[PDB]
């Protein structure tokens, strides 16, 4: 009969977090306008054979995260744990996939000090990867709390607000993925 206080606090903070990514987006666009015709410039060669499967995994993690919310709203703690463990594994795969992309980009001459494109690319995607890592920590902390006490409505609220952050992270990546790999 009353709005969820934790949900309102999380959504309010999630809106503010978007302005942090606004600054990173401004840096990428400012450097893109000064590229001069090459964006990305040589020797940076983005490959979609790896980014696309990595992006699809993160998108699929949102669906399983939503499934855990349905279990949490249903009062099924075991269903919530199964879906959030699966979500954590795919979220971890996203971090490993991004890092594996980072290793090959560095070997081919795309680094933060190497070029202006490397600076904006790594800051924008790296800070998002830090947000993904923070989301994985939230999953572990929330799941550890599931083994401490009985499944209460306040505990179910904590599961919902964590999924809000995960959905926010996934949506931001879609903007980053479309802006970097398609709007060149």
């Amino acid at each position: 009969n009353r709005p969820n206080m934790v949900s309102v606090g999380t959504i309010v903070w999630l809106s503010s977090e978007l302005m942090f990514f606004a600054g990173l987006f401004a840096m990428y666009f400012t450097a893109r306008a000064q590229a001069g015709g090459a964006w990305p410039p040589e020797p940076t060669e983005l490959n979609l054979a790896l980014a696309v499967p990595v992006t699809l995994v993160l998108i699929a993690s949102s669906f399983t995260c939503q499934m855990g919310v349905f279990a949490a709203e249903r009062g099924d703690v075991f269903g919530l744990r199964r879906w959030y463990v699966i979500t954590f594994l795919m979220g971890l795969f996203f971090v490993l996939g991004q890092g594996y992309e980072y290793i090959h980009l560095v070997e081919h001459g795309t680094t933060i000090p190497g070029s202006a494109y490397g600076s904006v690319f790594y800051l924008a995607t790296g800070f998002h990867g830090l947000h993904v890592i923070g989301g994985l920590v939230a999953f572990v902390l929330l799941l550890a709390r599931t083994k401490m006490s009985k499944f209460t409505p306040a505990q179910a609220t904590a599961a919902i607000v964590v999924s809000y952050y995960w959905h926010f992270v996934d949506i931001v990546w879609i903007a980053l993925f479309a802006t970097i790999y398609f709007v060149r």
Partner: protein
Amino acid sequence: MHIEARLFEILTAFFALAAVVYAVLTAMFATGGVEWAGTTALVLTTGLTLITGTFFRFVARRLDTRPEDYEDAEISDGAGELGFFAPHSWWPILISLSFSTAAVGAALWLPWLIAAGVAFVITSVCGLVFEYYWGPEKH
């Protein structure tokens, strides 16, 4: 809670108008074309009010009038338990100390101090989250 999001929708419309006007006015008769830094900030400033306003719009249409949303409600209408509010906790000062340790390490570029700070933050945040959920000791 119909007033709360009406505040954000009003801000959303103005931010959307300013973002569109600034982008168009910088595209024409402005050196360098579209000024990307301000346009990006204005566009995503509209996003901030849009997400909060849309959420408040969905919450408002679900639940009926609250006692604080009534134009003639009585004090006795709000009787009952409000919720959980933490009485005391020394974890927040530990979280800030943990975060300040990482910032000092990042300021002076000491990777060992950064690693210690990150580990301290995780432990401090874990204590705050688990403070009111730890069970009794089992022996």
